[PDB]
Design a protein around this ligand. Sequence first.
Ligand SMILES: *[C@@H]1O[C@H](CO)[C@@H](O[C@@H]2O[C@H](CO)[C@@H](O)[C@H](O)[C@H]2NC(C)=O)[C@H](O)[C@H]1NC(C)=O
Lengths: 49, 49
Amino acid sequence: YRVLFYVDSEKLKQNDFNSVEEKKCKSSGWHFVVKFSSHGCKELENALK
Amino acid sequence: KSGFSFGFKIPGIFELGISSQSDRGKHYIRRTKRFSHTKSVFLHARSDL
Ligand SMILES: *[C@@H]1O[C@H](CO)[C@@H](O[C@@H]2O[C@H](CO)[C@@H](O)[C@H](O)[C@H]2NC(C)=O)[C@H](O)[C@H]1NC(C)=O
């Protein structure tokens, strides 16, 4: 009475997360009747999982 | 955003004033996601007596 049982259990888990966010805003105004105004912002956001 | 104003007056008042403002901003977004899972089970049995 012989018995031979082989079990090969394998589990693999891998997870990667990366997020990049960059925001830059620049505004300049000069007046000397003369009036000048400039306003502009930029926003960038990215996320991957 | 941008704005400009100019005014000039000289008495002999006479007076003149002009102002200009222009604003425009655009926002764009996009989201994509995908998920796929596969599960397969193969069982084979053979017995001889
Ligand atoms: C859009 O971006 C948002 C950022 O909040 C994402 O929202 C969450 O993202 C995380 C990332 O793993 C998930 O675990 C959460 O379940 C998300 N929450 C919700 C309420 O969605 C979102 O996944 C992005 N993509 C879309 C909305 O399609």
